[PDB]
Amino acid sequence: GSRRYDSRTTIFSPEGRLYQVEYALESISHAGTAIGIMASDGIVLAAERKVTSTLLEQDTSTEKLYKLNDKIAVAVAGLTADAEILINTARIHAQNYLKTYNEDIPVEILVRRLSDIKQGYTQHGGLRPFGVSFIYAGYDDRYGYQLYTSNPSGNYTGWKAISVGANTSAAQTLLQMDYKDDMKVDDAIELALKTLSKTTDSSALTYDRLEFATIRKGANDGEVYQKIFKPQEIKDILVKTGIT
Amino acid sequence: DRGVSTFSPEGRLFQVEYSLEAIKLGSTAIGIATKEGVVLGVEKRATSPLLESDSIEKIVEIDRHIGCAMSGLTADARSMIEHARTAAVTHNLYYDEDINVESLTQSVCDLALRFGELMSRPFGVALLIAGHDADDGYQLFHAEPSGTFYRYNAKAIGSGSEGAQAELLNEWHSSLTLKEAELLVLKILKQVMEEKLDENNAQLSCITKQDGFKIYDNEKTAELIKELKEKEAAE
Amino acid sequence: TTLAFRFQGGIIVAVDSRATAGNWVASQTVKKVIEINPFLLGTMAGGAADCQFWETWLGSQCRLHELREKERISVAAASKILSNLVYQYKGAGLSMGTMICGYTRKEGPTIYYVDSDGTRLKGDIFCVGSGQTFAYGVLDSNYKWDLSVEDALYLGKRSILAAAHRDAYSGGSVNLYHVTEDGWIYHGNHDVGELFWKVKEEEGSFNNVIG
Amino acid sequence: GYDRALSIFSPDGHIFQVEYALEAVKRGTCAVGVKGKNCVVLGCERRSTLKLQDTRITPSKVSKIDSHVVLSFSGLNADSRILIEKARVEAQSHRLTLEDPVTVEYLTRYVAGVQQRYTQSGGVRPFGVSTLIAGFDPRDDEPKLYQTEPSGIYSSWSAQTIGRNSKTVREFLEKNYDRKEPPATVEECVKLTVRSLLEVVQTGAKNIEITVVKPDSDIVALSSEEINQYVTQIEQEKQE
Amino acid sequence: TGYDLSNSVFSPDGRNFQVEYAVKAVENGTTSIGIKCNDGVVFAVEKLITSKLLVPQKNVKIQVVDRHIGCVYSGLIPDGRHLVNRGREEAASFKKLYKTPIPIPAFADRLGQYVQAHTLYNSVRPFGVSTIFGGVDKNGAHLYMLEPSGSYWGYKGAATGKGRQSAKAELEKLVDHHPEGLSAREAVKQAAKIIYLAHEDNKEKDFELEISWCSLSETNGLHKFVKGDLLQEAIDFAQKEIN
Amino acid sequence: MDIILGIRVQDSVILASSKAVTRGISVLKDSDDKTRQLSPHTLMSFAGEAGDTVQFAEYIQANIQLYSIREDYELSPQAVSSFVRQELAKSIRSRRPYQVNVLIGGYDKKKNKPELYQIDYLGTKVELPYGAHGYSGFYTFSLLDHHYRPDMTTEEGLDLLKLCVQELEKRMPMDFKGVIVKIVDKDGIRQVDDF
Amino acid sequence: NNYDGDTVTFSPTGRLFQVEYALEAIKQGSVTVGLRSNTHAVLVALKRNADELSSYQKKIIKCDEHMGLSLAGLAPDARVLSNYLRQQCNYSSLVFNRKLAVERAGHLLCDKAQKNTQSYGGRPYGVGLLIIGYDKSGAHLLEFQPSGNVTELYGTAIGARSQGAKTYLERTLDTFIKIDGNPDELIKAGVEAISQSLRDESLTVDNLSIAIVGKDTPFTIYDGEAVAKYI
Amino acid sequence: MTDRYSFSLTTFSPSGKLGQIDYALTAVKQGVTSLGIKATNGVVIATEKKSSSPLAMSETLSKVSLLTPDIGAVYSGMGPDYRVLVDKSRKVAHTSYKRIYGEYPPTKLLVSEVAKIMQEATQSGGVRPFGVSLLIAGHDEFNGFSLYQVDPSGSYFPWKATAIGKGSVAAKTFLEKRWNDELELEDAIHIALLTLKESVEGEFNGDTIELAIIGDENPDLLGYTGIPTDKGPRFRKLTSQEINDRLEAL
Ligand SMILES: *C(=O)[C@H]1NC[C@@](C)(O)[C@](O)([C@H](CC2CCCCC2)NC(=O)[C@H](CCCC)NC(=O)[C@@H]2CC(F)(F)CN2C(=O)[C@H](C)NC(=O)CN=[N+]=N)O[C@@H]1C
Numbered sequence A: 001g002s003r004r005y006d007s008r009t010t011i012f013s014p015e016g017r018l019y020q021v022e023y024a025l026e027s028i029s030h031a032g033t034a035i036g037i038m039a040s041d042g043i044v045l046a047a048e049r050k051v052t053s054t055l056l057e058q059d060t061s062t063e064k065l066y067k068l069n070d071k072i073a074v075a076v077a078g079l080t081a082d083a084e085i086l087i088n089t090a091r092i093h094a095q096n097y098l099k100t101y102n103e104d105i106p107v108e109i110l111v112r113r114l115s116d117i118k119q120g121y122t123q124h125g126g127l128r129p130f131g132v133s134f135i136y137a138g139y140d141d142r143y144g145y146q147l148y149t150s151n152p153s154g155n156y157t158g159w160k161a162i163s164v165g166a167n168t169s170a171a172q173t174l175l176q177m178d179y180k181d182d183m184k185v186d187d188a189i190e191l192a193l194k195t196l197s198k199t200t201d202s203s204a205l206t207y208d209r210l211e212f213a214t215i216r217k218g219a220n221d222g223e224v225y226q227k228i229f230k231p232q233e234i235k236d237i238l239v240k241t242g243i244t
Numbered sequence B: 001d002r003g004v005s006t007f008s009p010e011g012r013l014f015q016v017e018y019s020l021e022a023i024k025l026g027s028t029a030i031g032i033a034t035k036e037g038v039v040l041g042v043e044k045r046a047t048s049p050l051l052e053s054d055s056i057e058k059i060v061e062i063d064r065h066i067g068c069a070m071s072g073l074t075a076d077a078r079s080m081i082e083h084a085r086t087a088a089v090t091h092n093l094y095y096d097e098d099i100n101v102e103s104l105t106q107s108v109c110d111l112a113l114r115f116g117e118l119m120s121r122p123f124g125v126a127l128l129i130a131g132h133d134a135d136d137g138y139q140l141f142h143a144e145p146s147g148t149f150y151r152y153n154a155k156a157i158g159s160g161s162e163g164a165q166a167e168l169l170n171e172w173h174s175s176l177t178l179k180e181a182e183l184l185v186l187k188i189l190k191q192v193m194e195e196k197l198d199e200n201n202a203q204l205s206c207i208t209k210q211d212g213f214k215i216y217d218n219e220k221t222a223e224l225i226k227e228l229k230e231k232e233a234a235e
Numbered sequence C: 001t002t003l004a005f006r007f008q009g010g011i012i013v014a015v016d017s018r019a020t021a022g023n024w025v026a027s028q029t030v031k032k033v034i035e036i037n038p039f040l041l042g043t044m045a046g047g048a049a050d051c052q053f054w055e056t057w058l059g060s061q062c063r064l065h066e067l068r069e070k071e072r073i074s075v076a077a078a079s080k081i082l083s084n085l086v087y088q089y090k091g092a093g094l095s096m097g098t099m100i101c102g103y104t105r106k107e108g109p110t111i112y113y114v115d116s117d118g119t120r121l122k123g124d125i126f127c128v129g130s131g132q133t134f135a136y137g138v139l140d141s142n143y144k145w146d147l148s149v150e151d152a153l154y155l156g157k158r159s160i161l162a163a164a165h166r167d168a169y170s171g172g173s174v175n176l177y178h179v180t181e182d183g184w185i186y187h188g189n190h191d192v193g194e195l196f197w198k199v200k201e202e203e204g205s206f207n208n209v210i211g
Numbered sequence D: 001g002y003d004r005a006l007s008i009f010s011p012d013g014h015i016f017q018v019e020y021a022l023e024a025v026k027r028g029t030c031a032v033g034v035k036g037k038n039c040v041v042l043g044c045e046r047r048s049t050l051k052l053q054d055t056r057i058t059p060s061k062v063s064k065i066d067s068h069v070v071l072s073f074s075g076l077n078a079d080s081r082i083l084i085e086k087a088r089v090e091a092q093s094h095r096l097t098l099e100d101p102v103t104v105e106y107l108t109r110y111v112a113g114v115q116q117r118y119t120q121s122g123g124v125r126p127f128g129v130s131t132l133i134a135g136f137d138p139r140d141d142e143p144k145l146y147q148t149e150p151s152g153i154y155s156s157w158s159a160q161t162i163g164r165n166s167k168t169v170r171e172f173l174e175k176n177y178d179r180k181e182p183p184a185t186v187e188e189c190v191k192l193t194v195r196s197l198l199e200v201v202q203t204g205a206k207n208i209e210i211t212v213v214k215p216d217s218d219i220v221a222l223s224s225e226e227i228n229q230y231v232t233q234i235e236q237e238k239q240e
Numbered sequence E: 001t002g003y004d005l006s007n008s009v010f011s012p013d014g015r016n017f018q019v020e021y022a023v024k025a026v027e028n029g030t031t032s033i034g035i036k037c038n039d040g041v042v043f044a045v046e047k048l049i050t051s052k053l054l055v056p057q058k059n060v061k062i063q064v065v066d067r068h069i070g071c072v073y074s075g076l077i078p079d080g081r082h083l084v085n086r087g088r089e090e091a092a093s094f095k096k097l098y099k100t101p102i103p104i105p106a107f108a109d110r111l112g113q114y115v116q117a118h119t120l121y122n123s124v125r126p127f128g129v130s131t132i133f134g135g136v137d138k139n140g141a142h143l144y145m146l147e148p149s150g151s152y153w154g155y156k157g158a159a160t161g162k163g164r165q166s167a168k169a170e171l172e173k174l175v176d177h178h179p180e181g182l183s184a185r186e187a188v189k190q191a192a193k194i195i196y197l198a199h200e201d202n203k204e205k206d207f208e209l210e211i212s213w214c215s216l217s218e219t220n221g222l223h224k225f226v227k228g229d230l231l232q233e234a235i236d237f238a239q240k241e242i243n
Numbered sequence F: 001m002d003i004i005l006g007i008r009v010q011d012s013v014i015l016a017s018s019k020a021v022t023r024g025i026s027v028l029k030d031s032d033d034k035t036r037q038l039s040p041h042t043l044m045s046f047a048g049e050a051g052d053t054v055q056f057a058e059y060i061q062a063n064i065q066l067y068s069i070r071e072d073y074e075l076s077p078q079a080v081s082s083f084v085r086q087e088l089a090k091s092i093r094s095r096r097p098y099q100v101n102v103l104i105g106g107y108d109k110k111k112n113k114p115e116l117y118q119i120d121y122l123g124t125k126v127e128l129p130y131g132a133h134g135y136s137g138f139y140t141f142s143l144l145d146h147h148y149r150p151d152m153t154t155e156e157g158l159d160l161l162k163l164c165v166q167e168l169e170k171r172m173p174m175d176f177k178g179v180i181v182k183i184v185d186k187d188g189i190r191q192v193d194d195f
Numbered sequence G: 001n002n003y004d005g006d007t008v009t010f011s012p013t014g015r016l017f018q019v020e021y022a023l024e025a026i027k028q029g030s031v032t033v034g035l036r037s038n039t040h041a042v043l044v045a046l047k048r049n050a051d052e053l054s055s056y057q058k059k060i061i062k063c064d065e066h067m068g069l070s071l072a073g074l075a076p077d078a079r080v081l082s083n084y085l086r087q088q089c090n091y092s093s094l095v096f097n098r099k100l101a102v103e104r105a106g107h108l109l110c111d112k113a114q115k116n117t118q119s120y121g122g123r124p125y126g127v128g129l130l131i132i133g134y135d136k137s138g139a140h141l142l143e144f145q146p147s148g149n150v151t152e153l154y155g156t157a158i159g160a161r162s163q164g165a166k167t168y169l170e171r172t173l174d175t176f177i178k179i180d181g182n183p184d185e186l187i188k189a190g191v192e193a194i195s196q197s198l199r200d201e202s203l204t205v206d207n208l209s210i211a212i213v214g215k216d217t218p219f220t221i222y223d224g225e226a227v228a229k230y231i
Numbered sequence H: 001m002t003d004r005y006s007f008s009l010t011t012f013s014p015s016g017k018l019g020q021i022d023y024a025l026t027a028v029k030q031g032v033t034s035l036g037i038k039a040t041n042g043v044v045i046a047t048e049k050k051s052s053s054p055l056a057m058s059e060t061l062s063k064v065s066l067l068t069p070d071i072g073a074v075y076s077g078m079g080p081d082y083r084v085l086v087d088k089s090r091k092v093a094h095t096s097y098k099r100i101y102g103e104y105p106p107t108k109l110l111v112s113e114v115a116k117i118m119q120e121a122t123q124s125g126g127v128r129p130f131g132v133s134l135l136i137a138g139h140d141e142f143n144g145f146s147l148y149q150v151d152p153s154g155s156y157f158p159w160k161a162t163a164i165g166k167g168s169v170a171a172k173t174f175l176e177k178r179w180n181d182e183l184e185l186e187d188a189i190h191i192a193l194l195t196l197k198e199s200v201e202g203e204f205n206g207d208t209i210e211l212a213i214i215g216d217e218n219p220d221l222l223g224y225t226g227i228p229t230d231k232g233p234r235f236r237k238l239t240s241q242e243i244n245d246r247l248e249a250l
């Protein structure tokens, strides 16, 4: 019958590893780098678009940075189309929690839910996991600024600064070197770009290859703003920091 | 790979025969039926001295007139016990009487071949089912994962079994007293057990018409072990 | 007519033994107390079928609880299986009024009213059925906590006799139970036939009746 | 639905998927539980290969099931959440129908049942998780400590360890735990647990977490400094 | 290779080897035949006597569909019975809605599409039978033969199982030597002769002849078994022609 | 059933709820607590059909206690009320709707503010300085309209409730066998054992 | 070989190995004999003990007052098939007031076995059955094979060494068929038939299992001292 | 029976590749060249009508397809895969947008929905990925004119201009030279016809080229008059004749 053709996507190796998870992780290591850096007064997200063209329409393009609600965004590393399936599911948890409790979802609850879905594809169903790792940048009134990551295995962890996709080893070492707890969003922005600048597989870091987003309390009074930076704005922040 | 419900060229179910191997690896269990009652004994086989051995539950009550000892992948015995207990109480509800030991066993064995591509594989555990009923008196059954059950005057399952069965072959007669059967189970356990037999790594139980199914206190089993050592020293 | 009340000396449970289909007296010798286990009584009022089926079913569910948990069920959890069961049938037209009476160690002597609209109430005194108001009248005006076992038994029996007399639907006989830390003890069938005349003579009561 | 038998027998009576699940637990960070006379202490390794972490919001290794029962684990973290969520739900379901919190033995037996089911259900692999489940029965002052494993077997333990280098710390506890006299106090019990982890951990810094469960829903996670004092005293008593 | 290990897989030839293997199970069976006559059809089959313990005339192989259709097969007997059970459902559902007993061409395509459906998926095994069936409808007599692939055609005469080549020769002669056509009573004799002649390829065990027929004149267009004298008269005519 | 009152004062919320349980022409019990703690700073009172009341109360409790364990955090009164409302609004279009009206009295530890929510079996939610379900409101609303002030102390709150129970013991037909009174403040939930 | 993985795969010579392997489990099973006259039908089954402490596995299941079978091979499969027969005998009784024909029981067994040979994921029944019945056309014996092949016979035997009894019954055919209105003589001839399939072991009181059905005899199973008579 | 293929036929290889998507991209590479150029006031999508036989009427094979009045799609790779995608794409513009909001979906969201159907075919049990790459040109009131590419994986990207299939590498390099941000539609048609000439071997005329534009509203193609706010479809397939006129100024 059918059994002859079944890969068996949800089994353990003799070592106790999940094949498909480990191989999906391998997949994500070749995706553009995404950086999250958490400061005292906000979070920076920064990510590199993979070898673009001169004819790619950059101002109506979104491969890396997606809005989940008005308080939380993700940075994607892996299969974009796989990421869009999960983002749409997370967007609906956020709107279900807001309908049920009349309060914006706490960041760690949404992250646990998306991580639980992923975990499902690794224990039952017979389907391939999602070739996607997320950086969650979010704000809620319990824990303030929060940076998370989740990966095909559905495991998640909190971070002060973290990378996913390509050259994370190289990127983690540079962040581990220049991060400090009392850092501010402007300092974090500068750290984010310097990191990508050295870990980029490209010759030079230019605006047309970057996606950038800051979650600031840099919103007038006791409220939070999300800024998905425009091409021209990335180009201005690249000159300010002095990388072009 | 190949079907879970597949026959070998000798006309046996692979998965059934492979489960029978798992059962051989499990700790020993011995039943002896007499005219004064049935006795069930088990080796606990604690993996470490830090494990509170009385938390090892390998002898289990199904109703007041039916006990059960297990050997093999003992976690698989849980859903089987649940079914047996539900069967016994359910029968009691529909008929206002005690369910026959054979009928209870046959209900457990009806689960055994409900595997395919129902549960994914056969059970990795054998059950000695001991009870009394007015119809067929004191009874001991062996319930394999094949769906087969044989009635026995005495039966050993688990690692010691072919050694123990040979010994039960000689020792058993139709006139054994309960007190005799108790020593006989302790004796044969001590033989086939790795660690030295005491009241913490071996449990006794019996089923009598008067008192129903009784797991023995460690103190009581310790008196019978001490009685065994003296009667084996005697000659 | 069923009652159960707590007192100093545990719990008294008394039931009449009459079964009616409208104005037709179906029986005078029916049993209205199910002995679930040695420390658990259930009283029955309402549909004859609805009570017998779901109370002997409660007995099975209590048996499964002690096999699975190696421990006799709490009156709380016993009452709550019945109340959760009827609550699933709410609107379907089940008819039941029951008191689950028992002693466990954690709880002490305990009485739970459970009816077929899903009401579950803990309490020291309940009277259930068509005769309930008649029983309440005698019981409520003679009840102290400090009754002797012997007085308490009698006051229960006398409260059922009362309702057996006035209430057209109660009658037959009185069945008496005493619930202690040592379990339930049955205190006999008393045919209202003889009991009425014995009580009237001895007590000098029932003066409304041609002697 | 995907019906495939993933947990099957092998010619030598082994279920390899269950055994490869145990291998995932060996790989997991270490976990230890030591029951004293009037407490149980759960102790959990934190691998220091991840620094720049946020320890405020990172999932803690010890999970409250109810106010009186906690669950620690070794193995796949993603798997452990499913078991904790299923236990926390059953814990509220038990309160709602029995008008009583679960016993530690009942909660253990439930979680072990769930692990067993995933070894003979089609379409599913076993849990890559072993658990220590500790706490006190409602209105009881006797400490409880149970261990579950992928196969679904469970058992009570005076003390026990699971995960990487659990062989070494089980060795330690086997010579340093006296059944006739268990750690009389909380101080003694937490000391024996930190000692047992210091056989395997590396640094006595943010690599050790300690949670103390006392009777009647009294559960408190120790802080870095409180643990770091136990680390300082154990090595100053050793320089001898 | 590996193209023959799974049903509904095309080989590079463009063939379905699991179907071609089913045909082997067929070729392995006892000889069954069909002969279309003037106003009807005659079926006949070879029933090997494995042992003297077989009760003569009891293990009947030819099966009726509705009241007007004969079906006989060669190969795995149970596969054939499974196909007739479906056929009876198809003939019951067609009569229920349309009132008229199922026309034979229509019946044939009901079997055709069903068997053909068992070559579309790797989750089913093809049928291990070639089936010979037919009867009398509103448009006269029709004889059909149907193969494990789902292939079927109208036939003047049909043969399948171990003695098919022998039978096919004896049939080919009758078609050539009777252009105006055969009578049902004639076809019953010939049927007996062609089963005795085709028995040469199974000549180890002695056999039990079985004939059935549907004829507008001789049975009113209803399927009936050939029994008693008319059977003896056919077995006689058959025994005379081999000697 | 029939008597559940709530009054939100300066720094607490006071729920008063009748002790009578009446089936037919008998008062079966005279000491019934028509309340469930949902969390340490949120109390829910309930009145409506027999069976439904407690099954709904206990169901909501079990969900809020589950949320509390999972998140090791206590939902705001606003969040609990919104959860409860949506449950009722879902029930109203069910095969057999929950026939239960609730008051939800909670102290919000974040805003340091007491809050009273009134929700009916249809899922009709409102935040009120004072509320009541069934016939009680016909007396107590006009009474409180006159005597209430926002800046009243818990002691004034309790005197104002005594006024409401007396008016109800004077002009209501049924004997509701007095009220059980509970204060929800910054220190949690406590029962006033003399009323 | 490569074509024995599952039941849904023909070999290149048109064989179904899973079915042939299931057929194998029957040869390994203990011997059982069927034979009939015109008035009675008889099952004689050799029961097989696991050892001396064990019972002798019951081979004969009653299906109705007028029908019941003997088994060889997987006993849990003889339970499933007998249970299915019990229903069909029962459905015939309840709906048509009609004792189910022995011939039609065969057709229904055959067709149940077949569905397990043409479908993926299932497996053939691993047991052979001998059905005996008295019905509206007299005494009947049927042999069931889990291929789905059912055969009406005067007499037969299945299981280990069955070939001895099957030769003897092939010789005795003209004798035992004429044992009308004499049950004990037809059982003798059954016990003498099974004897031809014995080696080393002989027929003891707890070894032998006999059934009989007939003109005015309900299907009744004789075990223990009941059969001492015939040893 | 029953589809017993409830498991993924696309899985991660040890290298972290998805073989079945890579192989799908290979089938798309073999496919005939199609391109898209975005002007200031329109978008052009074009492909070669590779006629299998000369007996075949290539008019009856629509490689360029209207999805909504203001959106068209063209492809490279497996024509059958494409056809059923156009069916699903047209229906999903209705069920998941127009029947809810009462207007046609914007280009990026319809693309999003086509993308989703293609992703599911890389992860759903018992199916292979779609063997096509789509170029989708569209106009909506809030995003203006747009051009997107959709791959077997489900990935989609916005382009100023691009090409897919056989002669893409060369065709992309040719567009990079000619494309500025000031192009008028007619200029983008003139470049689309040049770019397409490089990849075609045999005939090059209006009967072997399929070319559609997203431009101005066509009231003449609406079918009815009397509602001012309905001004007609922006999608327009150029006629054989219309293409040939522009080939004389080439
Ligand atoms: C004290 O208050 C007693 N009151 C009298 C009482 C008769 O009302 C009753 O509640 C008893 C309690 C039963 C007695 C039998 C043992 C179980 C408890 N109830 C009845 O006797 C019951 C009254 C029904 C009206 C609610 N009787 C019946 O249901 C009778 C009994 C019967 F046998 F006759 C059958 N039947 C019926 O009423 C009819 C035949 N069927 C139905 O009712 C079907 N249900 N529906 N719809 O005792 C108090 C303890």
Ligand SMILES: [Mg+2]
Binding pocket: F118, F119, F120, F124, F125
């Ligand atoms: Mg309202």
